[PDB]
Amino acid sequence: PFXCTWAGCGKRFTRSDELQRHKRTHXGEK
């Protein structure tokens, strides 16, 4: 799976593109 390895985070998604959806809350430019 694809896991969000963000500081203070750690969520796992079966789609790199829900992963990149979630990564939304951390990211602005990306």
| Contacting positions for Zn ion (CB under 5 A) | 4, 6, 9
| Cβ 27 vs Cβ 17: under 8 Å | no
| Shortest spacing between CB 29 and Zn ion, in angstroms | 16
Closest separation between CB of residue 16 and Zn ion, Å? 13
Quote the least distance from Cβ 9 to Zn ion, whole Å.
3
CB nearer to Zn ion: pick between 9 and 12: 9
- Dist CA 29 CA 14 (whole Å): 23
